[PDB]
């Protein structure tokens, strides 16, 4: 079952979390990790936040201390694996044997086909190298265009505005943060960015570019010194596809992290997996999933009596003065708003319910509310709705009961 030696492809958060948990749970056999980036393993959330602002990569490294006795092959690409021979072929000419193979290869930014032949700077934001490249162009008074309405682009927008960069943004949908965010939150976030000087363009798509100017499908133009494309990511599942595993923009896994190929597991951004709230398969693109799924899969490999992965989804986003936290589903049949939604010292909580049951929550500048809401969410609590709205109501009280 858990058969030595263990080989992990990818050296991001999911991989680090997984191998640390293998060691902590008591597995003492060989562990080898193959990472294509020639970088000490690092966390990605800082890249559009404090790193983009302050540039010190030695503040963003992952702690591999809880993963002793691991050989990290950095700057090496796994090119294929043979699931019958139980081997992995590396770009440096070597081959690794495995008893258990774990695919933790993440996802890469989608390219925008209409900007393929662009003759102006066009970047995406995924890696430390990407971040350094973009930062090297955040000249004060320069003009940045962001393509996409997702959180990473908005975090970059906020960082850029703080640095004195003019920012425009084009969004194909009618609202920002179309994925996994309540409409009430999305509408407020737009109001915030607009108030901070971001030039927002909704329901627009990029049709091309000419001599430093981007073209839109309404027949208009946006000049910029740099374009950062952030229209989502695609799973890095090429090795899995070639080896015959079930994949569809993501490697299908069950709650034990098993793929359709025996002795091969997958975790993190590369996986398509069950969302227990919706009961549907989804590719879950969050820090908490990478860590939590990695830990759960490792724990169950060492101890088969352990339950499968069961954590509910959540993420956070730091956008200027907004500290955003979102858990569970974006919507249900009811939203309860705790507090006022205002640009004057923003602070509020949203709760989404389905037939009385909490299925999601949002906190903006209220971390203290978020933890008890996540616990209520976890057991599908059906609290008193007026109490949920009432500001006199304390939420940590409810969760404890």
Ligand X SMILES: Cc1cc2nc3c(=O)[nH]c(=O)nc-3n(C[C@H](O)[C@H](O)[C@H](O)COP(=O)(O)OP(=O)(O)OC[C@H]3O[C@@H](n4cnc5c(N)ncnc54)[C@H](O)[C@@H]3O)c2cc1C
Which residues make up the interface to ligand X (CB under 6 A)? 9-15, 34-37, 44-45, 47-48, 77-78, 104-107, 125-126, 152, 236, 239, 268-269, 285-288, 290, 315-317
Please state, in angstroms and rounded to a whole number, the distance separating the CA atoms of residues 317 and 2.
Answer: 36
Cβ 263 to a second copy shortest distance, Å: 8
Q: Is 128 helix (H, G, I), strand (E, B) or coil?
A: helix
How many binding residues for a second copy (CB under 8 A)?
A: 20
Nearer of residues 204 and 272 to a second copy, judged by Cβ: 272
CA–CA distance, 102 with 3 (Å, rounded to integer):
12
Shortest Cβ 300–a second copy spacing (Å): 10
6 is written with which tokens? 């263990």
For the chain, report the end-to-end CA distance as a whole number of angstroms: 40
Q: Is 244 in the site for a second copy (CB under 8 A)?
A: yes
- In this complex, which beta carbon is closest to ligand X, that of residue 250 or of residue 332? 250
Three-class SS of residue 79?
strand
User: In terms of CB distance, is 81 or 348 closer to ligand X?
Assistant: 81
Residue 255 interaction partner, one of a second copy, ligand X, none, beta carbon < 5-8 Å per kind: a second copy
Among residues 255, 302, 341, 371, the one that binds a second copy under rule CB under 8 A: 255
Among residues 313, 314, 361, 356, the alpha carbon closest in space to that of 333 is found at 356
- Cβ nearer to ligand X, comparing 21 with 285: 285
Of residues 266-305, those binding a second copy (CB under 8 A): 273-274, 279-281
Partner whose binding site includes residue 274, from ligand X, a second copy, none (CB under 5 to 8 Å by kind): a second copy
Q: Write the CA distances from 60 to 11, 50, 104, 128, integer angstroms.
A: 14, 9, 19, 10
Alpha-carbon separation of residue 376 from 286, 312, 324 (angstroms):
21, 11, 19
Query: Residue 256 and residue 139: Cα distance in Å, rounded?
Result: 47
Binding mask 304-333 for a second copy (x = CB under 8 A): ----x-------------------------
- Work out the widest C-alpha separation in the chain, in whole angstroms: 65
Q: What are phi and psi of 234, to 5 degrees?
A: -120, 135
Residues that bind a second copy (CB under 8 A): 244-246, 248, 252-256, 258-262, 273-274, 279-281, 308
């Amino acid at each position: 079952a858990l058969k030595a030696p263990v080989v992990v492809l990818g050296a991001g958060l999911a991989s680090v979390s997984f191998v640390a948990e293998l060691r902590q749970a008591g597995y003492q056999g060989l562990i080898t990790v193959v990472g294509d980036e020639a970088e000490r393993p690092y966390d990605r959330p800082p890249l559009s936040k404090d790193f983009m602002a302050h540039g010190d990569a030695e503040k963003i490294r992952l702690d591999c201390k809880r993963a002793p006795e691991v050989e990290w092959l950095l700057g090496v690409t796994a090119q294929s694996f043979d699931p019958q021979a139980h081997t992995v072929a590396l770009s440096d000419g070597r081959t690794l044997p495995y008893g258990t193979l774990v695919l933790a290869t993440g996802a890469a930014p989608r390219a925008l086909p209409t900007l393929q032949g662009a003759t102006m700077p066009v970047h995406t934001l995924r890696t430390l190298e990407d971040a350094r490249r973009i930062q090297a162009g955040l000249r004060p008074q320069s003009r940045l265009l962001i393509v996409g309405g997702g959180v990473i682009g908005l975090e970059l927008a906020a960082t850029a505005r703080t640095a004195g960069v003019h920012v425009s943004l084009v969004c194909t949908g009618p609202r920002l943060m179309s994925r996994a965010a309540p409409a009430t939150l999305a509408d407020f976030v737009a109001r915030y960015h607009a108030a901070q000087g971001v030039d927002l363009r909704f329901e627009r798509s990029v049709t091309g570019s000419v001599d430093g100017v981007v073209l839109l499908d309404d027949g208009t133009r946006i000049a910029a010194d740099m374009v950062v494309v952030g229209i989502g990511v695609l799973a890095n599942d090429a090795l899995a596809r070639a080896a015959g595993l079930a994949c569809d923009d993501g490697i299908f896994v069950d709650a034990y992290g098993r793929t359709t190929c025996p002795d091969v597991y997958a975790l993190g951004d590369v996986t398509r997996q069950r969302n227990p709230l919706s009961g549907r398969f989804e590719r879950i693109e969050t820090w908490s999933n990478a860590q939590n799924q990695g830990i759960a899969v490792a724990r169950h490999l060492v101890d088969p009596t352990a339950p499968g992965y069961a954590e509910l989804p959540w993420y956070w986003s730091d956008q200027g003065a907004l500290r955003i936290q979102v858990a569970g589903l974006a919507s249900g049949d009811e939203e309860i708003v705790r507090g006022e939604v205002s640009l004057d010292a923003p602070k509020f909580t949203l709760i989404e319910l389905q037939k009385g049951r909490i299925v999601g929550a949002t906190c903006v500048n209220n971390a203290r509310d978020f933890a008890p809401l996540r616990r209520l969410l976890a057991v599908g609590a059906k609290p008193d709705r007026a109490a949920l709205a009432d500001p006199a109501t304390d939420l940590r009280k409810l969760a404890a009961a």
